[PDB]
Amino acid sequence: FPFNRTKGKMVRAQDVALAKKWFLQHPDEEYPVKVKVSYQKLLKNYVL
Amino acid sequence: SYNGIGLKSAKGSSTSGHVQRSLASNN
Amino acid sequence: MKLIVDTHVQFRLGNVDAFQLADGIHYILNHIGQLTGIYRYKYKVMHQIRACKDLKHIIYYKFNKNLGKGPGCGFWQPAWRVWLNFLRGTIPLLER
Amino acid sequence: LYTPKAEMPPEHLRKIINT
Amino acid sequence: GKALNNAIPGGPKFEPLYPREEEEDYNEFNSIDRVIFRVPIRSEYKVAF
Amino acid sequence: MPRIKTRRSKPAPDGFEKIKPTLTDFEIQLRDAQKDKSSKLAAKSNEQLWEIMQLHHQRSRYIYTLYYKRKAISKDLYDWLIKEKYADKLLIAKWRKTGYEKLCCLRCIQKNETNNGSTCICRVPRAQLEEEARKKGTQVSFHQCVHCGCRGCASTD
RNA sequence: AAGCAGCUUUACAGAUCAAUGGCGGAGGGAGGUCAACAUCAAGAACUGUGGGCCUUUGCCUAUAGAACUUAUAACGAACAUGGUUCUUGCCUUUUACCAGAAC
RNA sequence: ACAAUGGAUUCUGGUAUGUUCUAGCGCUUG
Ligand SMILES: O=P(O)(O)O[C@H]1[C@H](OP(=O)(O)O)[C@@H](OP(=O)(O)O)[C@H](OP(=O)(O)O)[C@@H](OP(=O)(O)O)[C@H]1OP(=O)(O)O
Ligand SMILES: [Mg+2]
Ligand SMILES: [Zn+2]
Ligand SMILES: [Zn+2]
Ligand SMILES: [Zn+2]
DSSP: OOTTOSOOOOOOSTTOOTTHHHHTSOOOTTSOHHHHHHHHHHHHHHHO | OOSSOSOSOSSTTSSOOOOOOOSSOOO | OHHHHHHHHHHHTTSSOHHHHHHHHHHHHTOHHHHTOGGGTOGGGHHHHHHHHHHHHHHHHHHTTTSOSOSOOOOOHHHHHHHHHHHHHHHHHHHO | OOOOOOOOOHHHHHHHHHO | OTTTTOOOSSSOOOOOSSOOOOOOOOOSSSOTTTOOOSSOOOHHHHHHO | OOSSOOSSSOOOOTTHHHHHHHHHHHHHHHHHHTSOOOOOOHHHHHHHHHHHHHHHHHHHHHHHIIIIISOOSOHHHHHHHHHTTSSOHHHHHHHTSSTTTTOOOSGGGOTTTSSSSOOOGGGSOHHHHHHHHHHHTSOOOOOSOTTTOOSOOOTTO
8 A cells, every 4th residue: 555546535634744764674694783763662552 | 483492571671571582592 | 042043044044055954953853952052951852952963973883885975965854853852841840 | 504714825824923 | 462461572562461471380280391392482483383 | 827927827818918918007006016015903904904905806807807708809819818927817707696796806806705605895886875874864875895995796797 | 458339428410399207407616724413442332214022121133224343353564651550660758750550 | 492671750948937118298277
């Protein structure tokens, strides 16, 4: 979503979470430890 | 992973909660 | 609010390139803890200040792949959404 | 009996804030 | 993982949902001379089932 | 589409250069009207707001009489002047109605602004105001309306 | 589905040019960062209508219509804050806080 | 045959506090 659609309703500019899909995925082993915490800490706000 | 080791949380512990496996204990 | 409006003024006066405007807005939203002092009077904002810091790590190491360390990243859309949701919950607080 | 809002000029706002 | 107080290796860490965990019953049920140790029960095993 | 000439904005059609000196004279009077002339009276300060609403009316009458009355500009130029905010779309849209031919502005017909469910008194014909004041034995007490200083928008006078 | 017939219409030449019968017609179309009023979380859930029982309610039976929202459950593919209470954290008091719960 | 990384700051701090500071004439007596 939403590229499998061809129609749909408008959403706000607030509601288009461009960076949400980055921390819902596994980062990789190559990232350092200060930015793997940022993946975990944004996941924690997602869960709550 | 939390395989029964570590802390319930690192809030009241005054540590970071960083667990690393002892390379000394193998056999 | 003024600090963000002033960069569009500097862009419109011709003093600031459009990439510097995108980088300037990105610098403001990620450094509100050192440009304003909003934490002194509402310390729950440290969630929002640490969200914009944690978003910056995600944005920089995808932006700066095969690039050097430098200023010009202006993908300010994730950190903009943080303060718009911070402003969502402090409207009922400050009106009271 | 509802007509919508009247859409003032931009200068009408502008004179007030200057005043 | 929040409810079981487990940590997925990339997932978030929370406070205990039931922090009153340290109570226990002295019983012959889960003793070492009872349990066959074949596969270590990982935290991924506890969350999948 | 904005007022500012951006790069998203469309270049003006053919007949624009003939009418541009007449529209600049409305544009420099609106810049001189917003100039913050410091006046201590409330009777004088709204009278300076009244001069802006007159210039907004007169700039839109000019584009109205070019296209609808004398047919002197094309439809593509006239749509450009509305999109570039040279003319008020919804005030011209009232001049086409029958009772609203010489309409003072969109604010003076709003039934919700007034304390009654009424229009402004500058919508009332002057001969009607002379008649009701003749029965009272006085001269008519209305001179200029408080919204934009009109003196009668009624189509009959 | 080419072609023939049946049917439905159609530009119509009609029969009638009456009583007819069918479909359409007896105050538009597209919209608006316009407004008002309803309505939007529950036995997987609604309402109108007819019939019967008890004496209106409720139940049973028959029928018509159900927009939006919902199953890896929710108007929002998005996501803040506050109050109270419980339990912690920081550790001069308070506010502002820490981070889990329940309402 | 190990990839596990909590924090973060503002406010409430010995002179405090308290008083007086009629210039520009209110009619008559004095
Ligand atoms: O000094 P480093 O450890 O290399 O980190 C810097 C630093 O951010 P962090 O210290 O939080 O990682 C910079 O931020 P400042 O604190 O100096 O403001 C940031 O750039 P900005 O200054 O614009 O925030 C820069 O990012 P980059 O150089 O990629 O633009 C980043 O360097 P890293 O790339 O190593 O994170
Ligand atoms: Mg005390
Ligand atoms: Zn008028
Ligand atoms: Zn008027
Ligand atoms: Zn008027």
